[PDB]
Amino acid sequence: MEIKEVDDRAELLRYTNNIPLLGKLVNHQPLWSTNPKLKSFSLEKISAPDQRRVQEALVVKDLLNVLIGLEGTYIRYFNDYEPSDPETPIEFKIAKKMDPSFKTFSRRIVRYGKQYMILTRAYEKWSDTSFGMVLQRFAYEIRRFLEDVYLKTLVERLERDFNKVPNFSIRELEQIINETEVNKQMELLYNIYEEIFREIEERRTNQSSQNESSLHLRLMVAFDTTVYPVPKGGAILKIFQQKILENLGDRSSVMFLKKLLNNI
Protein backbone atom coordinates (compact mmCIF):
# COMPACT_ATOMS: atom_id res chain seq x y z
CA MET A 1 0.00 0.00 0.00
CA GLU A 2 1.53 3.27 -1.18
CA ILE A 3 1.44 5.97 1.50
CA LYS A 4 -0.22 9.01 -0.07
CA GLU A 5 0.57 12.38 1.51
CA VAL A 6 -2.54 14.25 2.70
CA ASP A 7 -3.29 16.93 5.29
CA ASP A 8 -4.45 15.34 8.56
CA ARG A 9 -5.37 18.05 11.08
CA ALA A 10 -7.33 17.53 14.31
CA GLU A 11 -8.53 20.52 16.34
CA LEU A 12 -10.96 21.08 19.20
CA LEU A 13 -14.50 22.13 18.35
CA ARG A 14 -14.93 25.43 20.19
CA TYR A 15 -18.73 25.04 20.05
CA THR A 16 -20.25 22.53 22.47
CA ASN A 17 -23.75 23.76 23.37
CA ASN A 18 -25.53 21.82 20.61
CA ILE A 19 -23.54 18.66 21.36
CA PRO A 20 -24.56 17.01 24.67
CA LEU A 21 -22.26 16.71 27.69
CA LEU A 22 -21.12 13.21 26.67
CA GLY A 23 -20.99 13.83 22.92
CA LYS A 24 -18.30 14.57 20.37
CA LEU A 25 -15.76 17.28 21.16
CA VAL A 26 -13.21 16.95 18.32
CA ASN A 27 -13.19 16.84 14.53
CA HIS A 28 -13.09 13.57 12.62
CA GLN A 29 -10.14 12.35 10.58
CA PRO A 30 -10.44 12.44 6.78
CA LEU A 31 -12.14 9.52 5.07
CA TRP A 32 -10.43 6.88 2.95
CA SER A 33 -11.47 8.17 -0.48
CA THR A 34 -11.49 11.80 0.64
CA ASN A 35 -7.83 12.23 1.59
CA PRO A 36 -6.14 8.86 1.02
CA LYS A 37 -3.39 7.87 3.45
CA LEU A 38 -2.78 4.37 2.06
CA LYS A 39 -3.22 3.16 -1.51
CA SER A 40 -6.09 0.68 -1.64
CA PHE A 41 -4.85 -2.70 -2.83
CA SER A 42 -6.73 -4.53 -5.58
CA LEU A 43 -8.83 -7.25 -3.95
CA GLU A 44 -8.83 -9.40 -7.10
CA LYS A 45 -5.15 -10.28 -6.58
CA ILE A 46 -5.74 -11.52 -3.01
CA SER A 47 -9.04 -13.24 -3.87
CA ALA A 48 -6.84 -16.03 -5.24
CA PRO A 49 -6.45 -19.01 -2.88
CA ASP A 50 -2.73 -18.48 -2.25
CA GLN A 51 -3.30 -14.92 -0.97
CA ARG A 52 -6.80 -15.57 0.37
CA ARG A 53 -5.36 -15.83 3.88
CA VAL A 54 -3.95 -12.31 3.49
CA GLN A 55 -7.34 -11.21 2.15
CA GLU A 56 -9.07 -12.71 5.19
CA ALA A 57 -6.62 -10.99 7.54
CA LEU A 58 -7.20 -7.64 5.82
CA VAL A 59 -10.99 -7.96 5.86
CA VAL A 60 -11.07 -9.07 9.50
CA LYS A 61 -8.87 -6.09 10.41
CA ASP A 62 -11.30 -3.82 8.57
CA LEU A 63 -14.15 -5.55 10.40
CA LEU A 64 -12.50 -4.96 13.77
CA ASN A 65 -12.21 -1.30 12.74
CA VAL A 66 -15.92 -1.28 11.88
CA LEU A 67 -16.74 -2.93 15.21
CA ILE A 68 -14.78 -0.32 17.17
CA GLY A 69 -16.47 2.30 14.99
CA LEU A 70 -13.93 3.29 12.32
CA GLU A 71 -13.41 2.88 8.59
CA GLY A 72 -11.43 0.15 6.85
CA THR A 73 -9.33 -0.15 3.71
CA TYR A 74 -12.00 -1.90 1.61
CA ILE A 75 -15.01 -1.12 3.85
CA ARG A 76 -15.67 2.63 4.03
CA TYR A 77 -18.55 4.92 4.98
CA PHE A 78 -21.63 5.65 2.89
CA ASN A 79 -22.89 8.83 1.23
CA ASP A 80 -25.71 9.38 3.74
CA TYR A 81 -23.26 9.35 6.68
CA GLU A 82 -21.58 12.71 7.33
CA PRO A 83 -19.03 13.03 10.16
CA SER A 84 -20.12 16.59 11.03
CA ASP A 85 -23.74 15.96 12.06
CA PRO A 86 -24.86 13.43 14.70
CA GLU A 87 -28.34 12.88 13.24
CA THR A 88 -27.13 11.31 10.00
CA PRO A 89 -27.82 7.63 9.22
CA ILE A 90 -24.66 5.55 9.59
CA GLU A 91 -24.12 3.08 6.75
CA PHE A 92 -21.06 1.51 5.14
CA LYS A 93 -20.04 0.63 1.60
CA ILE A 94 -18.05 -2.46 0.63
CA ALA A 95 -15.69 -2.91 -2.31
CA LYS A 96 -17.23 -5.31 -4.83
CA LYS A 97 -13.80 -6.69 -5.80
CA MET A 98 -13.91 -8.53 -2.47
CA ASP A 99 -15.28 -12.06 -2.67
CA PRO A 100 -18.98 -12.33 -1.73
CA SER A 101 -17.93 -14.57 1.19
CA PHE A 102 -16.02 -11.86 3.00
CA LYS A 103 -18.55 -9.38 1.60
CA THR A 104 -21.46 -11.09 3.39
CA PHE A 105 -19.48 -11.59 6.60
CA SER A 106 -18.50 -7.92 6.44
CA ARG A 107 -22.15 -7.02 5.83
CA ARG A 108 -23.05 -8.79 9.08
CA ILE A 109 -20.20 -7.17 11.02
CA VAL A 110 -21.10 -3.78 9.52
CA ARG A 111 -24.69 -4.22 10.67
CA TYR A 112 -23.28 -4.95 14.14
CA GLY A 113 -20.99 -1.91 14.12
CA LYS A 114 -23.72 0.34 12.74
CA GLN A 115 -26.06 -0.73 15.53
CA TYR A 116 -23.21 -0.03 17.95
CA MET A 117 -22.59 3.48 16.62
CA ILE A 118 -26.33 4.20 16.44
CA LEU A 119 -26.76 3.22 20.09
CA THR A 120 -23.67 5.31 20.85
CA ARG A 121 -25.21 8.44 19.33
CA ALA A 122 -28.48 7.44 21.03
CA TYR A 123 -27.12 7.50 24.58
CA GLU A 124 -24.96 10.53 23.73
CA LYS A 125 -28.11 12.45 22.78
CA TRP A 126 -30.07 11.01 25.72
CA SER A 127 -27.40 12.32 28.12
CA ASP A 128 -29.09 15.71 27.66
CA THR A 129 -31.47 16.97 30.34
CA SER A 130 -34.32 17.46 27.86
CA PHE A 131 -34.83 13.68 27.73
CA GLY A 132 -35.25 13.32 31.50
CA MET A 133 -33.01 11.77 34.12
CA VAL A 134 -34.66 8.36 33.64
CA LEU A 135 -33.55 8.37 30.01
CA GLN A 136 -30.18 9.73 31.15
CA ARG A 137 -29.78 6.73 33.46
CA PHE A 138 -30.84 4.42 30.62
CA ALA A 139 -28.17 6.09 28.48
CA TYR A 140 -25.55 5.62 31.21
CA GLU A 141 -26.51 1.95 31.52
CA ILE A 142 -26.25 1.45 27.75
CA ARG A 143 -22.82 3.11 27.75
CA ARG A 144 -21.63 1.05 30.73
CA PHE A 145 -22.78 -2.17 29.04
CA LEU A 146 -21.09 -1.25 25.75
CA GLU A 147 -17.90 -0.39 27.64
CA ASP A 148 -17.72 -3.40 29.97
CA VAL A 149 -19.10 -6.19 27.75
CA TYR A 150 -19.01 -5.48 24.01
CA LEU A 151 -15.63 -3.84 23.43
CA LYS A 152 -14.13 -5.77 26.35
CA THR A 153 -14.96 -9.11 24.72
CA LEU A 154 -13.85 -7.67 21.37
CA VAL A 155 -10.37 -6.75 22.62
CA GLU A 156 -10.10 -9.97 24.64
CA ARG A 157 -11.08 -12.47 21.93
CA LEU A 158 -11.11 -11.10 18.39
CA GLU A 159 -8.01 -8.89 18.48
CA ARG A 160 -6.02 -11.65 20.18
CA ASP A 161 -7.19 -14.21 17.62
CA PHE A 162 -6.28 -11.87 14.76
CA ASN A 163 -2.85 -11.11 16.24
CA LYS A 164 -1.41 -14.22 17.92
CA VAL A 165 -3.57 -17.11 16.66
CA PRO A 166 -2.55 -18.85 13.42
CA ASN A 167 -5.05 -20.67 11.19
CA PHE A 168 -7.84 -18.43 12.51
CA SER A 169 -10.99 -17.91 10.46
CA ILE A 170 -13.61 -15.17 10.27
CA ARG A 171 -16.17 -17.97 10.57
CA GLU A 172 -14.60 -18.98 13.88
CA LEU A 173 -14.71 -15.29 14.85
CA GLU A 174 -18.44 -15.12 14.10
CA GLN A 175 -19.01 -18.35 16.02
CA ILE A 176 -17.13 -16.93 19.02
CA ILE A 177 -19.30 -13.81 18.80
CA ASN A 178 -22.46 -15.93 18.71
CA GLU A 179 -21.21 -17.89 21.72
CA THR A 180 -20.48 -14.69 23.65
CA GLU A 181 -24.06 -13.68 22.73
CA VAL A 182 -23.18 -9.97 22.60
CA ASN A 183 -24.53 -9.76 19.04
CA LYS A 184 -28.04 -10.84 20.09
CA GLN A 185 -28.02 -8.38 23.00
CA MET A 186 -26.95 -5.59 20.64
CA GLU A 187 -29.70 -6.56 18.19
CA LEU A 188 -32.32 -6.49 20.95
CA LEU A 189 -31.05 -3.11 22.17
CA TYR A 190 -31.25 -1.79 18.61
CA ASN A 191 -34.82 -3.10 18.34
CA ILE A 192 -35.71 -1.36 21.61
CA TYR A 193 -34.15 1.86 20.29
CA GLU A 194 -36.14 1.52 17.05
CA GLU A 195 -39.35 1.09 19.05
CA ILE A 196 -38.48 4.20 21.07
CA PHE A 197 -37.75 6.04 17.81
CA ARG A 198 -41.08 5.13 16.20
CA GLU A 199 -42.83 6.12 19.44
CA ILE A 200 -41.06 9.50 19.22
CA GLU A 201 -42.14 9.77 15.58
CA GLU A 202 -45.78 9.12 16.48
CA ARG A 203 -45.69 11.54 19.43
CA ARG A 204 -44.15 14.19 17.15
CA THR A 205 -46.55 13.62 14.24
CA ASN A 206 -49.74 13.77 16.34
CA GLN A 207 -49.54 17.57 16.36
CA SER A 208 -53.04 18.91 15.64
CA SER A 209 -55.13 16.19 17.30
CA GLN A 210 -53.44 16.03 20.72
CA ASN A 211 -64.79 12.17 35.25
CA GLU A 212 -67.16 13.10 38.09
CA SER A 213 -64.94 11.60 40.80
CA SER A 214 -62.80 14.75 40.89
CA LEU A 215 -65.94 16.82 41.49
CA HIS A 216 -67.26 14.37 44.10
CA LEU A 217 -63.96 14.56 45.99
CA ARG A 218 -63.24 17.79 47.87
CA LEU A 219 -59.74 18.09 46.42
CA MET A 220 -58.26 20.72 44.09
CA VAL A 221 -56.96 18.28 41.49
CA ALA A 222 -56.59 18.43 37.72
CA PHE A 223 -55.00 16.64 34.76
CA ASP A 224 -51.92 18.10 33.05
CA THR A 225 -51.29 15.60 30.23
CA THR A 226 -48.88 17.68 28.13
CA VAL A 227 -47.15 15.13 25.93
CA TYR A 228 -43.38 15.41 25.44
CA PRO A 229 -41.59 14.91 22.11
CA VAL A 230 -39.76 11.93 23.65
CA PRO A 231 -40.89 9.39 26.28
CA LYS A 232 -39.88 10.22 29.83
CA GLY A 233 -40.08 8.35 33.12
CA GLY A 234 -43.36 6.45 33.26
CA ALA A 235 -43.58 6.26 29.47
CA ILE A 236 -40.14 4.64 29.23
CA LEU A 237 -41.07 2.30 32.09
CA LYS A 238 -44.27 1.23 30.30
CA ILE A 239 -42.35 0.73 27.05
CA PHE A 240 -39.76 -1.43 28.80
CA GLN A 241 -42.49 -3.43 30.55
CA GLN A 242 -44.10 -4.08 27.16
CA LYS A 243 -40.66 -5.11 25.89
CA ILE A 244 -40.26 -7.56 28.78
CA LEU A 245 -43.74 -8.93 28.05
CA GLU A 246 -43.02 -9.40 24.34
CA ASN A 247 -39.69 -11.06 25.20
CA LEU A 248 -40.85 -14.68 25.02
CA GLY A 249 -38.50 -17.62 25.57
CA ASP A 250 -35.16 -15.94 26.41
CA ARG A 251 -35.11 -16.05 30.20
CA SER A 252 -31.54 -14.74 30.45
CA SER A 253 -32.49 -11.80 28.24
CA VAL A 254 -35.51 -11.05 30.43
CA MET A 255 -33.25 -11.36 33.48
CA PHE A 256 -30.59 -8.86 32.49
CA LEU A 257 -33.25 -6.59 30.98
CA LYS A 258 -35.17 -6.42 34.26
CA LYS A 259 -31.84 -5.91 36.05
CA LEU A 260 -31.18 -2.88 33.85
CA LEU A 261 -34.78 -1.76 34.39
CA ASN A 262 -34.33 -1.84 38.17
CA ASN A 263 -30.99 -0.03 37.89
CA ILE A 264 -32.68 2.70 35.83
Partner: protein, 42 residues
Protein backbone atom coordinates in the same frame (compact mmCIF):
# COMPACT_ATOMS: atom_id res chain seq x y z
CA UNK B 1 -34.54 38.24 9.62
CA UNK B 2 -32.58 35.55 11.45
CA UNK B 3 -34.88 32.84 10.11
CA UNK B 4 -34.49 34.17 6.56
CA UNK B 5 -30.71 34.23 7.00
CA UNK B 6 -30.80 30.62 8.22
CA UNK B 7 -32.94 29.65 5.23
CA UNK B 8 -30.48 31.29 2.83
CA UNK B 9 -27.64 29.49 4.61
CA UNK B 10 -29.50 26.19 4.19
CA UNK B 11 -30.01 26.93 0.48
CA UNK B 12 -26.27 27.55 0.16
CA UNK B 13 -25.73 24.28 2.04
CA UNK B 14 -27.88 22.51 -0.56
CA UNK B 15 -25.87 24.12 -3.36
CA UNK B 16 -22.64 22.98 -1.70
CA UNK B 17 -24.14 19.50 -1.31
CA UNK B 18 -24.73 19.49 -5.07
CA UNK B 19 -21.09 20.51 -5.51
CA UNK B 20 -20.12 17.68 -3.14
CA UNK B 21 -22.10 15.20 -5.24
CA UNK B 22 -20.13 16.49 -8.22
CA UNK B 23 -16.98 15.96 -6.13
CA UNK B 24 -18.09 12.38 -5.41
CA UNK B 25 -18.75 11.52 -9.05
CA UNK B 26 -15.39 13.08 -9.94
CA UNK B 27 -13.84 10.91 -7.21
CA UNK B 28 -15.35 7.71 -8.61
CA UNK B 29 -14.21 8.78 -12.09
CA UNK B 30 -10.69 9.26 -10.71
CA UNK B 31 -10.85 5.81 -9.11
CA UNK B 32 -11.89 4.30 -12.45
CA UNK B 33 -9.10 6.03 -14.36
CA UNK B 34 -6.60 5.04 -11.64
CA UNK B 35 -7.64 1.41 -12.10
CA UNK B 36 -7.09 2.06 -15.81
CA UNK B 37 -3.56 3.34 -15.12
CA UNK B 38 -2.81 0.29 -12.98
CA UNK B 39 -4.15 -2.16 -15.58
CA UNK B 40 -2.26 -0.45 -18.42
CA UNK B 41 1.05 -0.23 -16.52
CA UNK B 42 0.98 -3.70 -14.95
Amino acid sequence: EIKSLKHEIKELRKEKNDTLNNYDTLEEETDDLKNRLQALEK
